[model samples]
Target: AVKHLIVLKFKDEITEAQKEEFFKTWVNLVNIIPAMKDVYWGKDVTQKNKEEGYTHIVEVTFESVETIQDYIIHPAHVGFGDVYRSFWEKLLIFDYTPRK
Candidate 1:
């Protein structure tokens, strides 16, 4: 299995409502992507002292790297990126392949 993880930092000026809207849009868009084994996302809730700079984390699972690549270029994914481009300040993506 392959896991694609994203950590996102929003601009300080972003409001709670805007964050909520982004999550709503993300959830809706992921539903349209094919070959997605699972998708999970949530706000950062770590202890304040140990917290990282990012405010949100998303994990997407696929059967393999090829499946993940398909998701990267999928039209629905592209459409969401265009719509939500303004809300995020920084994004970090990491790909993980299971070791066996």
Candidate 2:
């Protein structure tokens, strides 16, 4: 299994209410892509200084590292990526195999 992390710094003009609607579609990926075992979202809660510009998080658990390719090409993912990029200022992504 592997964990995929996405940290987003949204555009200053975007509203929190708008972000809620975006993430609502994001979490629905668990049902759209078979390899996507789980999905979670949260806002940064650290000391304000440490947050930098990044404010939101999306953590995804996949059945395996290889299965991530399926997610990459899946139409659902591609569609969402387009809108997500439109609303954010900066983005960071990281993936790692789970220790367990």
Q: How high is the CA lDDT of each candidate model?
A: 0.81, 0.87
In order of appearance, the predictions have TM-scores of 0.82, 0.89
Backbone clash tally for model 2?
Answer: 0
Question: What tens digits encode model 1's per-residue C-alpha lDDT throughout 50-81?
Answer: 35578788888888888887887889888888
Distance from true location, Cα of 87 in model 2, Å: 1.0
1-100: candidate 2 lDDT, tens digit per residue: 7999988888998899989999999899789888789999998888475557888988999877899899988999999898677798888999998674
Name the runs in model 2 displaced over 4 angstroms.
48-51
What local lDDT score does residue 51 receive in model 2, on the 0 to 100 scale? 50
**RMSD of model 2, in Å?**
1.7
Per-residue error for 76 in candidate 1, Å, reads 0.8
